[PDB]
Swiss-Prot record:
Stated name of the protein: Fatty acid-binding protein, adipocyte
Effect of residue 21 to D: In a breast cancer sample; somatic mutation
Example of a GO cellular component annotation carried by this entry: cytosol
Species assigned in the record: Homo sapiens
Lineage: Eukaryota, Metazoa, Chordata, Craniata, Vertebrata
UniProt comment concerning the protein's domains: Forms a beta-barrel structure that accommodates hydrophobic ligands in its interior.
Residues that hold a fatty acid according to the record: 125-127
Keyword Nucleus assigned: yes
Keyword Cytoplasm: yes
S-S bonds: none
Amino acid sequence: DAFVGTWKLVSSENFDDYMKELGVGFATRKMGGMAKPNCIISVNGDVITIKTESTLKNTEISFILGQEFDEVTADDRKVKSTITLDGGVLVQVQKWDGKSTTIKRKREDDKLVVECVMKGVTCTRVYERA
Ligand SMILES: Cc1sc(NC(=O)C2=C(C(=O)O)CCCC2)c(-c2nc(C3CC3)no2)c1C
């Protein structure tokens, strides 16, 4: 849709702090910090696929809106994830061990803007079309 395409990370703010608040150890935060992933979003029928591709780590999720799914995150958390569409924003929550984090994906001008929240920490990542 508005989201479909191949997107390249161009800017990131507060990602290390976000990873820290998730309990991500130094080695994984080092891998993630200066990573510049591609994000490849596609849809077929009910099913949306979001692939994240980077030199040291790839991940992928496929989901139906509103339907919880199991996810292994890039930092090896086993989480229960639900993604919904709310006012044009893809809202993802991950729940594990009585905690939650939210990842919101929205389109703004030429940007795919990804807001990641854990407790008091807010990180913002911006992608543009590859
Ligand atoms: C090479 C890469 S990329 C990447 N994470 C992203 O790109 C992420 C997002 C996005 O921009 O889609 C949005 C949500 C957070 C993550 C990691 C990594 N995340 C984590 C914890 C924070 C989940 N630990 O490592 C690494 C090692």
